[PDB]
Homo-oligomer: 390 residues x 3
């Protein structure tokens, strides 16, 4: 039969209002405020956390403030291990009410809510990003959200901690928590190496032309949304590659200019004409390496025939010192993918190359380069096949 | 007087929580999961559908699973007709409760919910996209959502079916169901015909340059959100025109390059200078033809003075073989409109034309062309006049 | 302890469901429909308003319709003043219920809701945009939303009124009320003045080239979202500057072309080569002037090291009559900031200038120029420091 959920004779249940709040949360779970570590009230037997509010699959969880310590987690038995401090909902447990709504004595012991320590494989098997209490095919009764990486030393010491920022809805994403900006940067200048194919460094360090003979590695302002992407964990790829943490249709915006761009000089032999040189800027995705995602989680496999390289700007140098470019594209990206930008041109400086033989400010370089990477759509259901290949 | 809805002494009603869920749904109705046809349990007297969940103007509807068939719809009396299988809310009916919340016997017969067959004019008169239970000026008591086109044959046969995907929130749009991407494509190459004005084919087939003498019609990956737009239903316009299904402020992104671009050769007569040739890429809207929208529904009339053509890229060829371009614009579009892209240049190849006299890969063509069309704003209330004209 | 809000044994409270509706509203408050002035039922002792619905920090407020006047506000004692007509929630008051749910006589006198007149300093001290009932650090018990600027004359006269459109969710923003388009325009042509640095007029009037000798100030279609931005209130800056009303990460899109662009003519002395001329289009922010925001409200101070100028397009003229450009950037903007676009080039027309010595259609000008400014992210919490500087 046809069942009404919100109708005149319907009884609105807890599962119902959680499903509504989850929808309003864009199916994202996370700490809405507070719930950060309290080192002052942290010992070698107890871990303390400040008061706050979180939403886990539509269920509102609160750590209440009083008098501090707002809450205490038992660390006895935990030594010489790296654990995950998790907030867990266990629907197998029973919430115990006491007193009465008539007197002013109603209270509940929420045994369905736990603050605990889990190892990485245990958390992954009950992580909200991968499993759901509300799931259609595999509904679960126990779900968790990791708050902190906790590294316990020898018995009698206080532990080391690292916030799992992907699980905190801190700021930048309020209103559209599952979408918005993934990565963005300020304008930067980067020297073009004398090679056919090279990546453009999008992670905060550029090889900035500083003099007529040299370029030097210089920081530039960059921002990343930890829920959507992260800097590659391997030092070889760290300057260039992003690891995508969330499946979706993303929008990539690029702009800048190619300064000291090479071209064949107009001479009597070529009928006093500029010999333009081909170059292209491409965006790329690579999924050959598994476990790049947070917690070394399993990558999401892309559909058959998925793109790997896409031309954002393809043209010839026009005989000017500096020539501007701009591009905007929507692309499919998968959890675990590597995402990066490449600069492609010929290697013969006297024939097909967009780059010259100069170094530093005398050499061909990218000037005023910037980008924005944003999540603009999901790949749930049919979209995975229809929209996921490009 | 001033009435509080959510206040301490207020009674939260069914209409109230439906209005809240509708707001959380971005005022969009549709199947959230399941509710697809079950051909195995479909006969010549009954139509079967799988279990699922839908939200119709804030009212949650569920088809419950048990033992299949999850639900059965009586098809007796339906023959040699094309009908719409609809999910209807009728607030004139009375939901009948039985048993008690005290025992574990409470049940409701939701007579306010129906699975029925309607003809196209009947559905349109009570379609959720055009009429509302919550409406300010014309509030309705009966509202429907079409799920399937059902074509019944002769008495004793099983019918033919077609899913109304615009009414299924399948994927790509979760989180922002009323907005997001309307249409997008992968990079493609398209030969420029030797005419003054031509449309660029945005519906999946391009006239791809394949040799030095020929171009051939080749498919390219394209995606459309059925709720926002569709391929033109008339074969003459099918390669080029989109039909907009939903009013709004849309964002159009284009990029690519013009390859083998024509120009006046630098000669002694012109002081050894490149004679650039003007061309422009425009986006366009046309509402002359009514009933192009889904179900042949009535178009939404645009305000007085509305734009029809807008220049996205206007410039001269620069003497290079290939020159890249990019553009991003926000435009107003109305339900029933035709939306398309045009390439405009002169017809005299020796004087004003951006195109040459070559064919295939030797002829002027668009290379690496792609676009994204996205809904970024609505045209409700005052916005219709203020923002709707451009 | 860990408290559950939405769990099986939990009691869902009024504050709870208001917090849920506020989240669903993207933390924006405003009139959802109606609540506009009723001049017909307005006297010299009373102000009338039409029926409608508003949401103030998750609390639903309704003015009920019956027989008009839908509601009356006492204006006795108000003379020779400019007041703000405000809708206030005061949680210190007590809502008085009467009758019973058993009979059909339940009614509430919502003393927690008021329609009143406040002076600008009083409203600012209890304005929903700046203070919250739900606030973590400074929770308030009284909060208001301004609906109209009301200017009372001499005793015995009807007042003058001005709608506070920023507090009305009229249209264009339904679905994403706190985000979406801030400002947009149709394509326009603007003459480039013979100076090093000039602003491009983004507020609806351009100096349009009309003849071979003259340009004239001509209107062009422009739209602004009052909640996000406004035209500068000072006449000196009115054609060029926007005042940002809301903190955030914004996206700026620009496109157009530079027509009649200057360049050094190819002559025997320069080896028959085009001497390109540098120019740049920049977007800018300035916060030196306080109180530019609505109600002369205090500006939001940007973090240390914040950007002020950013290059969107930087390149040389290429020897063509017309050369197109496009740019897309994400930038940080603060409540009270001035936002504007500048055109920068050299002043020596025979050496470094992108502009020539012509006027009107014979002079260098921007052609088909348009832009979109959109709010794409917030600057709450950590984002203020991490993302706010660029
Ligand atoms: O090209 P290879 O060695 O297969 O692949 C390597 O470079 C790619 C491109 O940066 C990375 O995405 C891969 O994770 C890495 O294994
Ligand atoms: O130019 P015509 O014949 O008025 O109009 C025709 O072409 C337009 C442009 O493709 C379409 O939008 C119209 O639906 C069609 O009737
Ligand atoms: O340059 P000045 O005089 O400091 O600053 C003036 O021009 C700026 C740029 O238009 C405005 O933002 C300022 O509000 C105004 O005071």
């Amino acid at each position: 039969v046809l069942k009404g959920i919100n109708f005149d004779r319907s009884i609105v249940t807890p599962e119902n209002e959680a499903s509504i709040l989850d929808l309003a949360m864009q199916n994202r779970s996370g700490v809405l405020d507070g719930m950060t570590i309290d080192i002052l009230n942290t010992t070698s037997n107890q871990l303390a956390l400040f008061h706050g509010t979180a939403v886990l699959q539509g269920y509102g969880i609160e750590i209440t403030r009083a008098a501090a310590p707002d809450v205490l987690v038992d660390t006895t038995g935990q030594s010489n291990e790296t654990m995950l401090l998790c907030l867990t909902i266990d629907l197998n447990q029973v919430n115990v009410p006491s007193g009465t709504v008539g007197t002013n004595t109603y209270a509940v012991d929420y045994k369905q809510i736990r603050l605990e320590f889990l190892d990485v494989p245990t958390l992954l098997k009950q992580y909200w990003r991968d499993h759901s209490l509300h799931d259609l095919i595999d509904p679960r009764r126990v779900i968790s959200m990791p708050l902190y990486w906790i590294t316990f030393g020898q018995t009698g010491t206080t532990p080391l901690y690292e916030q799992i920022k992907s699980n905190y809805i801190d700021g930048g994403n309020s209103g559209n928590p599952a979408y918005g900006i993934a990565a963005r940067c300020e304008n930067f200048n980067h020297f073009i190496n004398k090679v056919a194919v090279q990546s453009i460094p999008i992670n905060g360090v550029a090889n900035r032309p500083v003099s007529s003979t040299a370029s030097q590695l210089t920081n530039y302002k960059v921002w990343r949304n930890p829920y959507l992407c992260s800097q590659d964990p391997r030092d070889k790829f760290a300057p260039d590659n992003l690891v995508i943490e969330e499946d979706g249709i993303y929008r990539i915006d690029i702009s800048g200019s190619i300064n000291i761009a090479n071209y064949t000089f107009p001479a009597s032999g070529n009928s006093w004409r500029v010999g333009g040189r081909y170059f292209q800027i491409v965006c790329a995705r690579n999924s050959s390496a598994n476990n790049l995602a947070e917690f070394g989680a399993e990558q999401h496999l892309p559909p058959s025939g998925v793109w790997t390289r896409r031309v954002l700007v393809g043209e010839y140098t026009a005989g000017m010192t500096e020539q501007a470019f701009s591009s905007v594209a929507t692309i499919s990206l998968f959890k675990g993918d590597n995402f990066f930008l490449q600069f492609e041109t010929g290697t013969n400086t006297s024939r097909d190359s967009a780059y010259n033989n100069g170094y530093g400010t005398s050499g061909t370089h990218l000037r005023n380069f910037s980008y924005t990477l944003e999540r603009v759509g999901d790949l749930n259901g049919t979209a995975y096949y229809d929209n996921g290949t490009f």
